[PDB]
Design a protein around this ligand. Structure first.
Ligand SMILES: [Mg+2]
Ligand SMILES: [Mg+2]
Ligand SMILES: [Mg+2]
Ligand SMILES: [Mg+2]
Ligand SMILES: [Mg+2]
Ligand SMILES: [Mg+2]
Ligand SMILES: [Mg+2]
Ligand SMILES: [Mg+2]
Ligand SMILES: [Mg+2]
Ligand SMILES: [Mg+2]
Ligand SMILES: [Mg+2]
Ligand SMILES: [Mg+2]
Ligand SMILES: [Mg+2]
Ligand SMILES: [Mg+2]
Ligand SMILES: [Mg+2]
Ligand SMILES: [Mg+2]
Ligand SMILES: [Mg+2]
Ligand SMILES: [Mg+2]
Ligand SMILES: [Mg+2]
Ligand SMILES: [Mg+2]
Ligand SMILES: [Mg+2]
Ligand SMILES: [Mg+2]
Lengths: 83, 100, 128, 115, 150, 211, 101
RNA sequence: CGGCCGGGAACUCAAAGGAGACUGCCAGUGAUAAACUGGAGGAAGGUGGGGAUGACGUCAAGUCAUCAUGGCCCUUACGACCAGGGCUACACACGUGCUACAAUGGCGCAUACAAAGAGAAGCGACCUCGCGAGAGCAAGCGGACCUCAUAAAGUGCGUCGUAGUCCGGAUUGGAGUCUGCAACUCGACUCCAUGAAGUCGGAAUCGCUAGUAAUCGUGGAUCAGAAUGCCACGGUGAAUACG
């Protein structure tokens, strides 16, 4: 994981989007490609459509997801079984 | 390799040399122990905003004569095949077949 | 007095032996024979030339060794003692040669070769 | 003898016998024994009742046995309920730390199931 | 060697007792180039065997060799598409090699704790005809007689 | 089977290097690249001047190029104007002052590179390959080469199936390291593709080594 | 006066030997005494390259660059010796590094 | 009490140039022979060891994705730029390796002996902090000088006493370090906790003739980070070959 004395990583454009959405109450989902950004406590209760390579899968950010990655909440491979 | 790939490498080297100083200073202020938290946060954000190709970790060494990205040798700046061809032609000083 | 000298070599070990008439002292690298070689086989190997000619307790040895390991250094010391005795007497040539101590064991370590795991060990082959 | 609700082997040395507790390893065994002022070489059935109480207190200083088991199960349940990638891997019974699954996952998959 | 001219290799004697037989025994027991370990094992085994029988270390080792030594073995010779185990007398060097090898195998497949003690017990059972190596020699001779006809 | 490059196996024994400068790891790559560019440019600019060899030396802060050619007059030009131009462009490419020295090879029929280039030129002018290589071998053996082998490979005559033909005269001992074997190669680009030419010329066995 | 060291590096030992011979002959001609050339350990950089264009890992070539080093010390350097050495015009292909003190 | 410091060219060592080994000598065998066997001398003996070196050709072998190239095809697209994803999937089959199944061993304490390499957008000492990965200050070193860098196996003492164990380490949970714009898919390493299978492996099959096999560590290229692979280096060091 990221070194602590550096801190948690978040993309600037996603940070700006989240700031606008929390300051304006915009319930429309945040379409983003920044899978690598960490979920911050100020995103709690927000719908984010995170890219998975082919589409933007929505994740409802709640309190338990803080510290994890949107990429952790958007699977990239489709597998339903061999037989 | 493709001319597009070779141009990509040239452009990456150009940008990497252009943005060296800011890159280094931002990394220094981020790494510093005796630095403010707001200062470190702002430095992180600015480093994130610099163009990606300005990072030297993105450039891949290529044979200077063919652009092949594999089999590189930093001493000669060439891939294995061109190294061997020039060595056999005697154009690389001191390099000769080794037995021991 | 005369401090006769002999250079020994084995594998990657070189030894410098200085023999002078005296007591039975053997001081290898400022240490006693046992303290340098705890292994009794190595101690015996070093003692072999002095036991062959009846001069075990009448010569003092000052020995330096570098390189190699335990067995290589014992062999180098034996070789150096042999040469020093040879310079000291020159009649012991026949006996030491017959015992085989005069020959420099030249067996070195084969370099690793391309396509093989070791000097000769080849990767496992499968028909299918 | 009886520490943290289990019987500790009587004939083994204190450190290894103390390692029988779920949640106590070699390093924690050394730490407990040094915090109770007791030699590691001494066999467990060579000690007095007071020393066993000191060991009891030092083990109660750590989270062991059923408390640790339920903490671990709750952490895995939290992962699985959260729906993260790790939770999905736990749900599906596949290696969770990036190990290859094309072959070599038999510790998680169990004995081989022929088609 | 189809071309031939292969010859045996000179082996130095052991330090403590100066015997080529003991040196070969140490080499046969040695694994992974750890000659010091094998030499210490052999020396401890010989010391305890000297305590057990009190004749000599080298003499005790020789007596165990005497008991174990095979006199004839069986070599395959294909005759009718199939093979016939033909009995052939073993030359003394190979006799010693096989005796030492069987002793080491029997000592390894034992139940005692330490290797030195396993070797000592195997040597005693060989010198009193009650060991696995003794059994192996008896088996070889028994099969040779059974296949005398070939 | 595949055969080692003769010059490569004999470098430092009877053959000299074509690049005889010293550099540390910092400037090794750049010097190799600059020498490659200089050799490429000079080859392209003197392709019609029978240039046999280019020896690049980098003394101190300069570069000196020795050009072994069969037509030193046509390389020098009128009174040195062409040499001046070449020095200018070479210095431009190398980034350091340049100096060009011309060395004449009086026996072009004994130089492997020149023989291969002549065969390639004849092939691109559509001369019959067998006649070309036979004449090359006869010329060299007549001018005194102790031996010569020429090999021409690849779609000879515009045929569908490629083949390789070779001719040898005298002795060409490739496994003898002290043998002086001048080897070189060339490619002829004709309307049916690439035709490869290889020439070995054996000119005696240097006995003193002389590096 | 302080001794001056000259380290000669080269890829060819005949070239470096001849250059060192010239330096020592000059220095002994011009008055000073020289405590050198001390052959120093020669470096051998080895490179292993695949030779086939596409496949066959086991077919490889091994090359080496051998850098030879000589060390020459000029002790009691006459005023003339320094500039004579700096105008000796050593052969091309020999890197010469001159240190003082 | 340290080659450390005056000092010495003795010795190891560093390279450069040479000497030496050729069935040369003796005896036997042999066909009045080539050669073979044995012996002396010798550091080396019969090609002393190893490497590089691959004949004419076979396989329409491999490579148009290193490169070059004849032809054929696309040209608001089969060309070019960007972000995210994939090459890391997983019922299964096969090949090559690593680690084990233990006592010739595991663990703890003390202590000994290498070679060859790499280093300037680099190697990074000493000292302080951290259990540890590491962090802070920072000398030296384009290096027989400085750093990487304490070799491991070994030796001596103790314990474990044949257990699925003080064997084995997979797997998993928690907490961290570093590189990097960024470690979710998808890094390496550290600490704590858990402790799967595994008790020597069927038909069958592979490598190896001596400093070899086996075993123990070290270095390098590629490389911001990322080897159980590859390429090198040394330590201990066998069994057998009748045919
Ligand atoms: Mg192209
Ligand atoms: Mg990279
Ligand atoms: Mg392989
Ligand atoms: Mg992985
Ligand atoms: Mg080849
Ligand atoms: Mg002889
Ligand atoms: Mg040959
Ligand atoms: Mg084909
Ligand atoms: Mg093939
Ligand atoms: Mg194909
Ligand atoms: Mg992309
Ligand atoms: Mg792949
Ligand atoms: Mg170096
Ligand atoms: Mg067991
Ligand atoms: Mg364990
Ligand atoms: Mg653990
Ligand atoms: Mg089981
Ligand atoms: Mg062989
Ligand atoms: Mg290894
Ligand atoms: Mg490295
Ligand atoms: Mg790396
Ligand atoms: Mg080895």
């Amino acid at each position: 994981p990221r070194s602590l004395k550096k801190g948690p990583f978040i993309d600037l454009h996603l940070l700006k989007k989240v700031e606008k959405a929390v300051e304006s109450g915009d319930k429309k989902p945040l379409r983003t490609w920044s899978r690598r950004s960490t979920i911050f406590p100020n995103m709690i209760g927000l719908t984010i459509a995170v890219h998975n390579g082919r589409q933007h899968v929505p994740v409802f950010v709640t309190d338990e997801m803080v510290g994890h990655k949107l990429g952790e909440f958007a699977p990239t491979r489709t597998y339903r079984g061999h037989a | 390799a493709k001319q597009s790939m070779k141009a990509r490498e040239v452009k990456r080297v150009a940008l990497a040399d252009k943005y060296f100083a800011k890159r280094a200073e931002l990394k220094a202020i981020i790494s510093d122990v005796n630095a403010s938290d707001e200062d470190r946060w702002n430095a992180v954000l600015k480093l994130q905003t610099l163009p990606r190709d300005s990072s030297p970790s993105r450039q891949r060494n290529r044979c200077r004569q063919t652009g092949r990205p594999h089999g590189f040798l930093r001493k000669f700046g060439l891939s294995r095949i061109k190294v061997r061809e020039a060595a056999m032609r005697g154009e690389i000083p001191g390099l000769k077949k080794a037995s021991w | 007095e005369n401090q006769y000298y002999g250079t020994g070599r084995r594998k990657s070990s070189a030894a410098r032996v200085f023999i002078k008439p005296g007591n039975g002292k053997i001081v290898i690298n400022q240490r006693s024979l046992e303290q340098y070689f705890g292994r009794e086989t190595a101690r015996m190997v070093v003692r072999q030339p002095l036991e062959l000619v009846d001069m075990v307790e009448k010569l003092d040895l000052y020995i330096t060794v570098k390189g190699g390991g335990i067995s290589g250094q014992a062999g180098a010391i034996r070789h150096g003692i042999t040469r020093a005795l040879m310079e000291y007497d020159e009649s012991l040539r026949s006996e030491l040669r017959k015992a085989g101590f005069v020959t420099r064991d030249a067996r070195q370590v084969e370099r690793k070769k391309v396509g093989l795991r070791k000097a000769r060990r080849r990767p496992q082959f499968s028909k299918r | 003898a009886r520490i943290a609700g289990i019987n500790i082997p009587d004939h083994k040395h204190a450190v290894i016998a103390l390692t029988s507790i779920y949640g106590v390893g070699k390093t924690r065994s050394k730490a407990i024994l040094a915090a109770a002022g007791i030699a590691e070489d001494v066999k467990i059935s060579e000690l007095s009742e007071g020393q066993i109480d000191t060991l009891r207190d030092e083990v109660a200083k750590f989270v062991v046995e059923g408390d640790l088991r339920r903490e671990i199960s709750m952490s895995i349940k939290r992962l699985m309920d959260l729906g993260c990638y790790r939770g999905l891997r736990h749900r599906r019974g596949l290696p969770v730390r990036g190990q290859r699954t094309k072959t070599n996952a038999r510790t998680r998959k169990g004995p081989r199931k022929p088609i | 060697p189809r071309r031939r001219v292969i010859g045996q290799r000179k082996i130095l004697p052991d330090p403590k007792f100066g015997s080529e037989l003991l040196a070969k025994f140490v080499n046969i027991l040695m694994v992974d180039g750890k000659k010091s370990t094998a030499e210490s094992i052999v020396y401890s085994a010989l010391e305890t065997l000297a305590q057990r029988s009190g004749k000599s270390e080298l003499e005790a080792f020789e007596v165990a060799l005497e008991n174990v030594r095979p006199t004839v073995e069986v070599k395959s010779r294909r005759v009718g598409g199939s093979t016939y185990q033909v009995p052939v007398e073993v030359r003394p060097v190979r006799r010693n090699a096989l005796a030492m090898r069987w002793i080491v195998e029997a000592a390894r497949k034992r139940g005692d704790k330490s290797m030195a003690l396993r070797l000592a017990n195997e040597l005693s059972d060989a010198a009193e005809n009650k060991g696995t190596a003794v059994k192996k020699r008896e088996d070889v001779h028994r099969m040779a007689e059974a296949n005398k006809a070939f | 089977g595949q055969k080692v490059h003769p010059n490569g196996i004999r470098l430092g024994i009877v053959k000299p290097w074509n690049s005889t400068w010293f550099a540390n790891t910092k400037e090794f790559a750049d010097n190799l690249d600059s020498d490659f560019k200089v050799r490429q440019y000079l080859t392209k600019e003197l392709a019609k001047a029978s240039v046999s060899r280019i020896v690049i030396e980098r003394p101190a802060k300069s570069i000196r190029v020795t050009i072994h050619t069969a037509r030193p007059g046509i390389v020098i030009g009128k009174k040195g104007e062409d040499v001046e131009k070449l020095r200018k462009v070479v210095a431009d490419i190398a980034g350091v002052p340049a100096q060009i020295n011309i060395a004449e090879v009086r026996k072009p029929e004994l130089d492997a590179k020149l023989v291969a280039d002549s065969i390639t030129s004849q092939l691109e002018r559509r001369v019959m390959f067998r006649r070309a290589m036979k004449r090359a071998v006869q010329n060299a053996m007549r001018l005194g080469a102790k031996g010569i082998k020429v090999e021409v490979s690849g779609r000879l005559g515009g045929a569908e199936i490629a083949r390789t033909e070779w001719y040898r005269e005298g002795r060409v001992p490739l496994h003898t390291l002290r043998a002086d074997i001048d080897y070189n190669t060339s490619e002829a680009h004709t309307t049916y593709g690439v035709i490869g030419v290889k020439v070995w010329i054996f000119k005696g066995e240097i006995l003193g080594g002389m590096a | 006066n302080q001794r001056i060291r000259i380290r000669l590096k080269a890829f060819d030992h005949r070239l470096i030997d001849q250059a060192t011979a010239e330096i020592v002959e000059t220095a002994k001609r011009t008055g000073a005494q020289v405590r050198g050339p001390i052959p120093l350990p020669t470096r051998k950089e080895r490179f292993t390259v695949l030779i086939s264009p596409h496949v066959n890992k086991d077919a490889r070539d091994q090359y080496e660059i051998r850098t030879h080093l000589r060390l020459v010390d000029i002790v009691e350097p006459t005023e003339k010796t320094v500039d004579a050495l700096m105008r000796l015009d050593l052969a091309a292909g020999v890197d010469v590094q001159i240190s003082l003190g």
